[PDB]
RNA sequence: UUGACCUCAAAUCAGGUAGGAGUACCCGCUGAACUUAAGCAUAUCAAUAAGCGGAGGAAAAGAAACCAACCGGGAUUGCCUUAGUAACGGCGAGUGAAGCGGCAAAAGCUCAAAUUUGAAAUCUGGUACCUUCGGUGCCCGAGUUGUAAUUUGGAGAGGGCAACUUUGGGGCCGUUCCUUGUCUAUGUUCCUUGGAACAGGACGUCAUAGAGGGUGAGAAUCCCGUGUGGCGAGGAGUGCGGUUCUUUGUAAAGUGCCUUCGAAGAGUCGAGUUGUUUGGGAAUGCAGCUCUAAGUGGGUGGUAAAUUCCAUCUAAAGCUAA
């Protein structure tokens, strides 16, 4: 809410309401570290979040013309 | 239970899978909306052709290295050899990939030729001027297509030197199999006296 | 280095006109850096030693290098880090005596 | 097709085709592959011999493109030449102009010798061949060229 | 005495902000058992239900400490496939990815960072006047324990010199779009039945309108609508036909050689142990405790270890539409 932060483009991204409580959702550095958010084969459970990955890999995907 | 002569099945439905059944009833609706998005985006980015120019690259993984395909972007070296800079190429419709490198002169020359063909076939509008409209063509991919390079002619002379070419595979397999043990044999012969 | 043109063997794969791309600036992060060498040598003589470094020096003097890399492999993680630390402490031993 | 099912014919008949004695229950022998070693052992050995136990050595992180080697046999091998050119290439067979067949460009990794190419010389470009494929190709007057 | 500085407080001080609701989807933590194994304890159910914390119109992820081993690809996400496969598992029941390939969409970047050192060049507030999502002046404050400019590895900076190319903004009407009003065809003609014609029969008409609904029974033609167009109204950071601030100006940004450099994230990587988790197997990830790095070196290269190479990225900081 401070205008030194609300101006100065390098930092006013923090004013976006998608950044309320980043440390409660795991969006700080230690949060993403504990969520497992890293690239590559060692992180196949956790790159897009493992509950999202689990839902993708446990969804049955049916088309109109069955495959 | 297990009963008569049937294949043993592996149907994975011992979770609550019915909470996670996606049926794609919206296939036609999402097609209508993707076409609507393409039309709306085309009208927003009038005359620009709705996709960037992509390079031709060789696909990895020896199952697929007989094919070329569209890659992500042109290679800073390819952009410089075509005669422009990367930060200006990103503004006139060329995809630039800073993280691929060239180790193939044929792929490099194909992409420099692709870039020079593109620069001859585009009309860059003046930045502040009248800029008369140049009739939007909607796709760079269908007007600079990815062509598989010709590797041989249809007919040649038979040049059989009697190498027998199955023996070539057998011998070349054997040198790889025994390279290390006989390099070590050679060095322990060298460690005599 | 140069491929042979056939599909198995030591240098298997297709013969291609090679190019040798320009060297990327990353691949140089483990750098020499005069500024950082100066900073590291100054901070080294300011901060001095660590207790396991002092145990490492007195085992190099008393027992020897092999037992020193054994206890350094225990104190650090790996044996290559143990070799690097023991070769650093040998240079400290050489510098503290010479001249 | 609900009207063609025998449920429509078992209407009026008490047990729906399941018997009055045995009297259709939930899971009378267990669920799934239960008791394949105890009460379903005869249906295992007799109709699934080899089902239980281990077989040889594990491969961690197998990529099934280290093993892409589709096999072509010489009995086909002239299908790869298109049909308009096939007739003129097998009529008046010739060295110093023999057809070049890239087998990789048609998507096979090995040539095998099933039998009897005609006696026309052919330049066969292959990643791999077998010995008898080599012998029959050279007996036709042709050559195998090794490619990668 | 007095004047600072640091740290800590107070005030119904000036301005502001948080809570709670909703919660289908989203990011986390926490977390069972019924069940299946024809018993059961590992396993499975399930990294689910319940519980708790936090968001948005999407969220998350995201421009490689990646995949690979090829003639190499190239941020992320999703679909098709990979594949019920590699692998895990009282190797029992069961579980179970990923690379490649084809598509949808596509977009790239920012700090720490350097002596501005012949300009703290930067910013909040108050006050005064205005062109009032802000600008300008002045004053107090923040700030050198570092705010601006330059630089982000793809690079880049300093110096030295042949050199050319490119100048940014602000209001009006139509127009991109949103909301909304209004206008726009043709039988209620005859006879029979009936309480009622909208029924039946006959003669017509309109149809880019014979969708639908009302009206005293099946109504294109009675009415509203429908179809096709026209005329408006009120709003949305503008693709363009004009407008104008016109010494906006030796700005700023690119591009060629030569030379010297090229800073790149620590109780972190890594290791051991414990627990959990995973398809991940002499440990896939996460966490607690203990040890604790380096600088042609750190990670990774799916069997533990020593030795020799090679290949590939550049973590321990950050943003971002579809
Ligand atoms: Mg955002
Ligand atoms: Mg973050
Ligand atoms: Mg966590
Ligand atoms: Mg997985
Ligand atoms: Mg996660
Ligand atoms: Mg989810
Ligand atoms: Mg799956
Ligand atoms: Mg379908
Ligand atoms: Mg399928
Ligand atoms: Mg039977
Ligand atoms: Mg259609
Ligand atoms: Mg849709
Ligand atoms: Mg599009
Ligand atoms: Mg290459
Ligand atoms: Mg890099
Ligand atoms: Mg002394
Ligand atoms: Mg039938
Ligand atoms: Mg009956
Ligand atoms: Mg009956
Ligand atoms: Mg009967
Ligand atoms: Mg029956
Ligand atoms: Mg009964
Ligand atoms: Mg029975
Ligand atoms: Mg029965
Ligand atoms: Mg028994
Ligand atoms: Mg078995
Ligand atoms: Mg075995
Ligand atoms: Mg094994
Ligand atoms: Mg043979
Ligand atoms: Mg107050
Ligand atoms: Mg709340
Ligand atoms: Mg949800
Ligand atoms: Mg989540
Ligand atoms: Mg249940
Ligand atoms: Mg089960
Ligand atoms: Mg049971
Ligand atoms: Mg039971
Ligand atoms: Mg049992
Ligand atoms: Mg029981
Ligand atoms: Mg589980
Ligand atoms: Mg579930
Ligand atoms: Mg819950
Ligand atoms: Mg709880
Ligand atoms: Mg909301
Ligand atoms: Mg969206
Ligand atoms: Mg986001
Ligand atoms: Mg993010
Ligand atoms: Mg990186
Ligand atoms: Mg690959
Ligand atoms: Mg590479
Ligand atoms: Mg990728
Ligand atoms: Mg899919
Ligand atoms: Mg596939
Ligand atoms: Mg399959
Ligand atoms: Mg599981
Ligand atoms: Mg793909
Ligand atoms: Mg980078
Ligand atoms: Mg009447
Ligand atoms: Mg009637
Ligand atoms: Mg009559
Ligand atoms: Mg009426
Ligand atoms: Mg009606
Ligand atoms: Mg009508
Ligand atoms: Mg109608
Ligand atoms: Mg209409
Ligand atoms: Mg610049
Ligand atoms: Mg870094
Ligand atoms: Mg530290
Ligand atoms: Mg740590
Ligand atoms: Mg847990
Ligand atoms: Mg588990
Ligand atoms: Mg573990
Ligand atoms: Mg562990
Ligand atoms: Mg391993």
Question: How would you describe this protein?
Answer:
This is part of a larger assembly, with chains A (67 residues), B (193 residues), C (99 residues) and D (148 residues). In chain A, 36% of the residues lie in helices and 4% in strands. Chain A has helices spanning 3-6, 22-25, 29-35, 50-58, and one strand at residues 60-62. With 99 residues, chain C is an all-alpha fold. In chain C, 57% of the residues lie in helices and 0% in strands. Chain C has helices spanning 34-47, 51-62, 65-75, 79-97. Chain D has a three-stranded parallel β-sheet. The chains are: A mainly alpha (67), B mainly alpha (193), C mainly alpha (99), D alpha/beta (148). Chains in contact: A-B, B-C, B-D, C-D. The interface between C and D is small, with 9 and 5 residues. Bound molecules: magnesium ion (74 copies). Residues 11-12 of chain D line the site of one magnesium ion. Chain B binds one RNA strand of 322 nucleotides through residues 1, 9-12, 14-16, 19, 24, 30, 34, 37, 41, 43-46, 51-52, 57-69, 71-73, 76, 85-88, 90, 95-100, 103-104, 106-107, 127-128. The PDB classes it as ribosome. The entry lists the keywords yeast, 80S complex, chemical modification, ribosome.
Q: H/E series of chain D, N to C?
A: HEHEEEEHE
Q: Assign an overall shape of chain D.
A: elongated
Structural class of chain D: alpha/beta
Percent range of helical residues of chain D: 10-25%
Count of helical stretches of chain B? 6
> Which percent bin holds the helix content of chain B?
25-40%
Q: Termini separation of chain D (Å)?
A: 55 Å
Strands of the widest sheet of chain D, in order across it, are: 1-3-5
**Helix-strand topology string of chain B:** EHEEHHHEHH
Number of strands of chain D: 6
- How big a fraction of the residues of chain B is strand? 5-15%
N-to-C span of chain B: 74 Å
Beta content of chain D:
5-15%
Output the number of helix runs of chain D.
3
Q: Give the biggest sheet of chain D.
A: 3 strands, parallel
Q: Count interface residues per chain for the largest interface.
A: B-D, 26 and 48 residues
Bound molecules: magnesium ion
Main structural class of chain B: mainly alpha
Main beta sheet strand tally, sense and closure of chain B:
2 strands, antiparallel
Keywords (chain D): Cytoplasm, Isopeptide bond, Ribonucleoprotein, Ribosomal protein, Ubl conjugation
Region (Disordered) (chain D): 1-38
Pfam family, one (chain D): Ribosomal_L27A
Subcellular location (chain D): Cytoplasm
């Amino acid at each position: 809410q401070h205008k030194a932060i609300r101006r100065d483009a390098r930092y006013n991204w923090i004013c976006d309401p998608v950044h309320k409580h980043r440390e409660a959702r795991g969006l700080t550095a230690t949060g993403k570290k504990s969520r497992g958010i890293n690239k590559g084969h060692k992180f196949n459970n956790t790159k897009a979040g493992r509950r999202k990955t689990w839902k993708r890999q446990n969804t049955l995907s049916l088309w109109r013309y069955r495959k | 239970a297990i009963s008569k002569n049937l294949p043993i099945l592996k149907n994975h439905f011992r979770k609550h899978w019915q909470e996670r059944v996606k049926v794609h009833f919206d296939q036609a609706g999402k097609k209508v909306s993707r076409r609507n998005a393409r039309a709306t985006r085309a009208a927003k980015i009038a005359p620009r052709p709705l996709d960037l120019l992509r390079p031709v690259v060789r696909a990895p993984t020896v199952k697929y290295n007989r094919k070329v395909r569209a890659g992500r972007g042109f290679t800073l070296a390819e952009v410089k050899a075509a005669g422009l800079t990367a930060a200006y190429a990103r503004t006139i419709g060329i995809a630039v990939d800073h993280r691929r490198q060239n180790r193939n002169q044929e792929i490099f020359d194909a992409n420099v030729q692709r870039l020079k063909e593109y620069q001859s076939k585009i009309i860059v509008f003046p930045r502040n001027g009248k800029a008369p409209e140049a009739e939007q063509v909607l796709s760079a991919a269908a007007t600079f297509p990815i062509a598989q390079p010709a590797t041989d002619v249809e007919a040649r002379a038979v040049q059989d030197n009697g190498e027998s070419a199955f023996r070539t595979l057998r011998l070349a397999r054997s040198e790889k199999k025994f390279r290390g043990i006989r390099e070590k044999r050679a060095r322990e012969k060298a460690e005599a006296e | 280095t140069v491929k042979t043109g056939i599909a198995i063997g030591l240098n298997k794969g297709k013969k291609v006109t090679s190019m040798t791309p320009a060297p990327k600036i990353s691949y140089k992060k483990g750098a020499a850096s005069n500024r950082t060498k100066f900073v590291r040598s100054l901070v080294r003589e300011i901060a001095g030693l660590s207790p396991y470094e002092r145990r490492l020096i007195d085992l190099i003097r008393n027992s020897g290098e092999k037992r020193a890399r054994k206890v350094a492999k225990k104190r650090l993680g790996s044996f290559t880090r143990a070799k690097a630390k023991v070769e650093e402490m040998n240079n400290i031993i050489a510098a503290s005596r010479r001249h | 097709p609900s009207r063609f099912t025998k449920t429509r014919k078992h209407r009026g008949h008490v047990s729906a085709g399941k018997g009055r004695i045995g009297k259709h229950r939930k899971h009378p022998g267990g669920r799934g592959m239960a008791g394949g070693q105890h009460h379903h052992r005869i249906n295992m050995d007799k109709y699934h011999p080899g089902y239980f136990g281990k077989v040889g050595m594990r491969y961690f992180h197998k990529q099934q493109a280290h093993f892409w080697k589709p096999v072509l046999n010489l009995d086909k091998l002239w299908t790869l030449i298109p049909e308009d050119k096939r007739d003129q290439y097998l009529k008046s067979a010739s060295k110093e102009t023999a057809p070049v067949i890239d087998t990789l460009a048609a998507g096979y990794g090995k040539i095998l010798g099933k039998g009897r190419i005609p006696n026309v010389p052919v330049i066969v470009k292959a990643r791999f061949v077998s010995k008898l494929a080599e012998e029959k190709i050279r007996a036709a007057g042709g050559v195998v060229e090794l490619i990668a």
